[PDB]
Amino acid sequence: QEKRKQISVRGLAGVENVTELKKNFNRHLHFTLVKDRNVATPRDYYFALAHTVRDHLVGRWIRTQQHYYEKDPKRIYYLSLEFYMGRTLQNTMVNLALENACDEATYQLGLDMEELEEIEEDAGLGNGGLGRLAACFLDSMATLGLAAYGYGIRYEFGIFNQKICGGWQMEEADDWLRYGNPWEKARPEFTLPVHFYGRVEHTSQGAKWVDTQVVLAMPYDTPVPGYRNNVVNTMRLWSAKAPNGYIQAVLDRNLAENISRVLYPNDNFFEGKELRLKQEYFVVAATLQDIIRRFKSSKFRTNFDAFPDKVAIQLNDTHPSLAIPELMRVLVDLERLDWDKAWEVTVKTCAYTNHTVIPEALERWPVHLLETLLPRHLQIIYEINQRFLNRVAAAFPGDVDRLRRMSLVEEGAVKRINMAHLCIAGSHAVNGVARIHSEILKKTIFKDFYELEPHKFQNKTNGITPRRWLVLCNPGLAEIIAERIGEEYISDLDQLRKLLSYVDDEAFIRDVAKVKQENKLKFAAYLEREYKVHINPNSLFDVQVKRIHEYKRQLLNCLHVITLYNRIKKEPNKFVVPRTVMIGGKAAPGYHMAKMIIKLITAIGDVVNHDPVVGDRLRVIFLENYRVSLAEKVIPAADLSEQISTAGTEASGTGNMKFMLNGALTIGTMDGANVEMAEEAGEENFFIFGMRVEDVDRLDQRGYNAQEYYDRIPELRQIIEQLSSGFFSPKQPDLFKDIVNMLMHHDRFKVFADYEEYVKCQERVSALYKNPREWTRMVIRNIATSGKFSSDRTIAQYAREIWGVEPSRQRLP
Amino acid sequence: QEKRKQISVRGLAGVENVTELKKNFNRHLHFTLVKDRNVATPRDYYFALAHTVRDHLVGRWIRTQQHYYEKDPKRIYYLSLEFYMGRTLQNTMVNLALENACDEATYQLGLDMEELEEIEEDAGLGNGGLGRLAACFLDSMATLGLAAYGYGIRYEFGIFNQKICGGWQMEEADDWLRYGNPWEKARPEFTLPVHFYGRVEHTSQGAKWVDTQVVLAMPYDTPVPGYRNNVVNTMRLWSAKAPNGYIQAVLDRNLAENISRVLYPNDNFFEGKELRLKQEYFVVAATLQDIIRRFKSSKFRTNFDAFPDKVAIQLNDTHPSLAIPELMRVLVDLERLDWDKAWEVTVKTCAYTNHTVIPEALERWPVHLLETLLPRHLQIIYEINQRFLNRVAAAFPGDVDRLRRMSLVEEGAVKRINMAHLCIAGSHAVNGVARIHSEILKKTIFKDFYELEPHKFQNKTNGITPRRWLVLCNPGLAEIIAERIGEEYISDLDQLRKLLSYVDDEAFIRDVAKVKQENKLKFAAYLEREYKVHINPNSLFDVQVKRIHEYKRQLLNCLHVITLYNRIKKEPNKFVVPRTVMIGGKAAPGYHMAKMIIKLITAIGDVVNHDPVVGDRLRVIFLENYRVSLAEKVIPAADLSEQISTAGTEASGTGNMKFMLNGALTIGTMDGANVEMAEEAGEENFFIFGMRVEDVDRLDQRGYNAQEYYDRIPELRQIIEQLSSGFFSPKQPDLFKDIVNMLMHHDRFKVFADYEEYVKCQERVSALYKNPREWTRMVIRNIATSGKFSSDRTIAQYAREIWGVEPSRQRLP
Ligand SMILES: O=C(Nc1ccc(Oc2ccc(C(=O)O)c(C(=O)O)c2)c(NC(=O)c2cccc([N+](=O)[O-])c2)c1)c1cccc([N+](=O)[O-])c1
Numbered sequence A, B: 001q002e003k004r005k006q007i008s009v010r011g012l013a014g015v016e017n018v019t020e021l022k023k024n025f026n027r028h029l030h031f032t033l034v035k036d037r038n039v040a041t042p043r044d045y046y047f048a049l050a051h052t053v054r055d056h057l058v059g060r061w062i063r064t065q066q067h068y069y070e071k072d073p074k075r076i077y078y079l080s081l082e083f084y085m086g087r088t089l090q091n092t093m094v095n096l097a098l099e100n101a102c103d104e105a106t107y108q109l110g111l112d113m114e115e116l117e118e119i120e121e122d123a124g125l126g127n128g129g130l131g132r133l134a135a136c137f138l139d140s141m142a143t144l145g146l147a148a149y150g151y152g153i154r155y156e157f158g159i160f161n162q163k164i165c166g167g168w169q170m171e172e173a174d175d176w177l178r179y180g181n182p183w184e185k186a187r188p189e190f191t192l193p194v195h196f197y198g199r200v201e202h203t204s205q206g207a208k209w210v211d212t213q214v215v216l217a218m219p220y221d222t223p224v225p226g227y228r229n230n231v232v233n234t235m236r237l238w239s240a241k242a243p244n245g246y247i248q249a250v251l252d253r254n255l256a257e258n259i260s261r262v263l264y265p266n267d268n269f270f271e272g273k274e275l276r277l278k279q280e281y282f283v284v285a286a287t288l289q290d291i292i293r294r295f296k297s298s299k300f301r302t303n304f305d306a307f308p309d310k311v312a313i314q315l316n317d318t319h320p321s322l323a324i325p326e327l328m329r330v331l332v333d334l335e336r337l338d339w340d341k342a343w344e345v346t347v348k349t350c351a352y353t354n355h356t357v358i359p360e361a362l363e364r365w366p367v368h369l370l371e372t373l374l375p376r377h378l379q380i381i382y383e384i385n386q387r388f389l390n391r392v393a394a395a396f397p398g399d400v401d402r403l404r405r406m407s408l409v410e411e412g413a414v415k416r417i418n419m420a421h422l423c424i425a426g427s428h429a430v431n432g433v434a435r436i437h438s439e440i441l442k443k444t445i446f447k448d449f450y451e452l453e454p455h456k457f458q459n460k461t462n463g464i465t466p467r468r469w470l471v472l473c474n475p476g477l478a479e480i481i482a483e484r485i486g487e488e489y490i491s492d493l494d495q496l497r498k499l500l501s502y503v504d505d506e507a508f509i510r511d512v513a514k515v516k517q518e519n520k521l522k523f524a525a526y527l528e529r530e531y532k533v534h535i536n537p538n539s540l541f542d543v544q545v546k547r548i549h550e551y552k553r554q555l556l557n558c559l560h561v562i563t564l565y566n567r568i569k570k571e572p573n574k575f576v577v578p579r580t581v582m583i584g585g586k587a588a589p590g591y592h593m594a595k596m597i598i599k600l601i602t603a604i605g606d607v608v609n610h611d612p613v614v615g616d617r618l619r620v621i622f623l624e625n626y627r628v629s630l631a632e633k634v635i636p637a638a639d640l641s642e643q644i645s646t647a648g649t650e651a652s653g654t655g656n657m658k659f660m661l662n663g664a665l666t667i668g669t670m671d672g673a674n675v676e677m678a679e680e681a682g683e684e685n686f687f688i689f690g691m692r693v694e695d696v697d698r699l700d701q702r703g704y705n706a707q708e709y710y711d712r713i714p715e716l717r718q719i720i721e722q723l724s725s726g727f728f729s730p731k732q733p734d735l736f737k738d739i740v741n742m743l744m745h746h747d748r749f750k751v752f753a754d755y756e757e758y759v760k761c762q763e764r765v766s767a768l769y770k771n772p773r774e775w776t777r778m779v780i781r782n783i784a785t786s787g788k789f790s791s792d793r794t795i796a797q798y799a800r801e802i803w804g805v806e807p808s809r810q811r812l813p
């Protein structure tokens, strides 16, 4: 209690407030939960606390949205298929300053609030960084006083819960709404119809899309509290409902309603399923009618010219790019605007964000698919293309190949639509997510596009919110910082720079290292308690957490681990810094290699964690079911953060940033925002290793030959042989043959080309660790220069150079 | 307002109470509904009122159930697949005395409570009288202070909403939970597993039912407020949940969970679908584990002898008869009691109620069905049979045919299990639902059973609650009665007898006729408003409301109607009492004749309601979507109640009783409880017509010949010819050919044998109507002797002669 108390960044536990809090809790438990302390379960406790928290939101929520209604600002909609929201109770107490009062309140009712908090389900409505980006962004736009709205799908089931079984992943259904959701509010009043299939008739009005199937979109609003400023914004998620023999028709209502059933769990990967495209059409069509409906109920042919003055639609990826042809659909067919005015309007409303350079991430929908589901949209996409391509022709006369290259229509055996091309055509702005990425789009992927309309293209380096990702998750760190520099930094992270004044302050040095070791013990107790996993709290915590993928080179990490192990066994008496190597993250079901790689990790620990010579010198664990809430625990405890993807394949990354905020040192490549983080801190304060992008490209120019590295490196040859022969899986010697063959003959990610430098760099890291003070002073240097990686920074830029709106930090009443 | 005020049976609108009520409403609208009066919709108003009402229940609910816990009475469980609950808000205000306060409260917030009330969805969780019986019974057991629990299934969709289209029924999905349900409380804490399929292994423990599929049963408790006595009992309804490629497995969770999706809409009819048997297994298995679990957490080999001292399980029909072999399943396999002790226990816990003599109503499950779904239950049913049949043998030595007749095993092409036989074998008591019915079971259907174990067999004449079915629905009638005799009658309906003192009281005569005419104008405004149906308020309201069936002889009614019409056209100048003939009720989808008959009704009105000669003399309407809530409106407005089924086919009826309570005169046959209602009132005060049961039987002895009546009755011949030739459906002359052929060659219900007497009796009815005073004095006689048809009477009998518990009317604190 005393620590929780002590922490000033957590607010006042005022006498009347704690008296009221406790009162509202009893009352909720009696009326809402229909309970007494004899029969309440912990879960009732949770729900009793959650209702009391949420009651603090309502008045603000009601009034913020009344204010938008009254004032009619320009409105920002953030359209995404994913909001990686994680839990909400701590979060709302944070931004409402209620955390220490609620803490005192509950203690006094004989209840540990942390314990109640662990009852809450995450809203795991995303797959990895774009989804989580989306959630960080709602928070910053709230904190920036913007008239912003998140728009997505209320899935039944979010990302699958991961169970490791026998060292393999087992997917279970994430039934996060089993017990209901105190956070959401049903909005029946705003249910809309969405039309699927049917056909198009050209009449004297124009076109008319007839004989369609109808699914209803039912919205559920969720409050988005800003930091301590009396703003509460909404996320609105749509859920599919069937319109209003005999038994079999009712049972078959499930078919329409399966559109919001389940997040597709393919991160960084296009699988072209029709159910996925219905998901995408669903959210798009409902959001844009709701949008056009608000526009209609606000100011005032007057109207639609001004529509881009009144509306911004941000496309998170190409997942809601049907926004473009739908907007046009409405304007042209329904509103009867002329094609050219309607196109002017669209391009002024819409901007697109790219998250990936990987070609296997791009959405390219078979036209037959689109032609059946969405006959009218296809026609509009053809008209869009034609006229766009007439523009390329005019600018590059005779450049026929360029026509073929820029076309939204991919020729082939299967015709398909390039959803990225679509998006660049129909948006006034196209961004990447970090300085290098946005250069490569301009230099490569969208090079011809850039030449056309160079003013379209921008950079918006990612951030993370310093509420969830420092104040919530690392209240310790948060508190020793506020102690020196006060509390303003929490929504002005650039204030962190002030901590460079403390690099040679003995109490600061001491406190920082104290806080991390405090977090290491907590994490280590979590592992015992929840998973009976025993780890060394006096070791280097080396963490790689992120979805499992080949580009991400969990495999290069595993080679480092087996090197460490093999060196020990060679010189057993020789000293080494003790490590706990933690690898966590989910594989897409059906990503065979990624599932292979999880299995190899746990296989490495089966060996490594049982060698008596090794003892407590090295330990390998796979952290089960990595999610937002799990992030919030292991990130504040890590010493080293692994950011090891091949140069040029991680667009930005954001995990990098969370680990920076919270006092880990980074081993990485110059990739994504790792480059800007090295810039911030100075490269003298990072562990940058291996190829730059230019060295990958030179490798590709002449040919990656994995065997060249094999033949030259006896250490890498010892491990390959281990893997082949069955050292890591004796009961099935041939188990890792597809890992080996990929590494040997088909590695698109060049793992062996970065091997020798990664291991030498890891040498450097452990040398620094053997001097605590100097570790802690470089850490200081890292924390101190992470303020650029706040999402307030990122969002203020989107507002000023895309949405064409001014941010704010003036408190509402 | 002034009438609503005036009504003393509706309680006090105390100054502080109205101040608190209004306060809790605002507060609910703010916190629960997240609203202001600018944005609230009516539906929010509703939900704001409902939350405030329900808050008055909670403390009582908590404490009533604490009291059962503390005291550990013997417990009554009422197992039914159906609870025809209808709406709840008015009902709870009634039994809590809050109706006039809530009335004043809302008025003062500028809201009409009646209007809010019309927003509520019925819980249409039943098909007709057994389902509704079930709901009347929860109410009486509450009012009688019994430790009773309703146990059923929380369907997704209750009985289909009926739409009449072109004069046909159209079924729509009753999505009654769309907007959620303020009345229910989720009980995750008491989720149980139910096992389907699998197989049986006989080991050294005994039998063991292995490799099963698991569905979870999730309970939702609903409060059952007693009348003004501070008892709140629970109805617990179970909802199916799936246990805790990749996408297609999540989507396929619907398959397990489709067990609670939808009420099967077959009233008075066995269709032998496996999904239906899963429904039946579901509710049974979950309820009995919950039951055996309570028994285990209460008093104390000690235990299970006393289990029938501590448990009563009432079987509403044979729908939960799997209760028997399941109870045994548990006792034998799980608890390891010996077969003979376990059988003693079962028979002492279980009693069965029969609702039907019709053979097409009986559940007779193919064994292969049972053998697959429920291998172990089948084995136990075989063992049960064997030993039961060994008992028949011993009592009737050599009577081989009797063996075959009594067997739970039906031989044939398809083997099947007789669920009724099952039930008589495994229950200590078997009842019918009205004096005549229970004689016929003893004399016919269960004759051999009766000879075996004559002490098994009982009668429990049905009732209806005089809260829903007078105080709620006819507050007028309720108020003029209380004016004379005070308010005690409401839970002592036998007090009504006191009104015979008023048969020659001019003010009483006047007030009764006033109240009915008041209800006639209201109903008539409902029809205009909600359905734009214009009716004559100065006519005789002749109502037949009940599910559509051949036994029920909606068709004999239609013949009366076309007689009336044809007589007018014959003598147009001749005076007749003006009628509005209202026929309402649903057909089972797939019951072809019943759907034909709806169509004939509306076809009759197409003719009849457009003949200018007829004018406002006769009008025929089909009342759409008959349900509990609709009952509550048209019953208080009817003059004549039609109870015209063939003698011996309506087991009891309860609609008869509602119309009696509320001041309609009855035309009927001596069938079901019509006979006891004629007894109560004296036959001089009823319109009894046609065959007695003995005259049906004599008809069957020699042969029903429909053509005999045709040849003898020129009036019935004029109509048959109308129907054939296409008078009622000129655009399709042949439309009613299957009605005609059934009437001519296959009428199991002898419509023509009752024709001449029904029409003459209808002559009598209209003669009486032409003298208002004398109508009103016979009505007085009817209201005055309906107290026997209260369900308090019925339930006190079940308690004393079945459950072996004393009723009570002492108020809880
Ligand atoms: O304008 C007034 N009130 C209001 C007015 C408006 C809104 O919010 C609002 C309503 C409708 C629309 C729209 O047309 O799209 C928008 C918008 O333009 O974005 C915003 C209010 N707050 C809410 O309705 C609200 C906010 C948050 C959550 C919920 N919810 O879960 O339902 C509801 C309260 C007002 C003006 C004057 C007097 C009163 N009053 O006394 O009640 C009220």
Ligand SMILES: O=C(Nc1ccc(Oc2ccc(C(=O)O)c(C(=O)O)c2)c(NC(=O)c2cccc([N+](=O)[O-])c2)c1)c1cccc([N+](=O)[O-])c1
Binding pocket: A033, A034, A035, A036, A037, A038, A039, B061, B062, B063, B065, B066, B068, B069, B185, B221, B294, B297
């Ligand atoms: O026994 C005590 N309290 C209690 C004890 C028990 C019950 O109800 C109850 C609990 C469990 C069981 C059971 O084992 O099956 C039964 C039963 O035997 O039937 C009844 C109470 N009331 C409720 O739990 C209740 C009632 C109605 C609705 C809900 N609901 O929706 O969740 C809950 C309150 C008690 C005793 C002493 C002190 C306190 N206290 O101070 O809190 C409480």
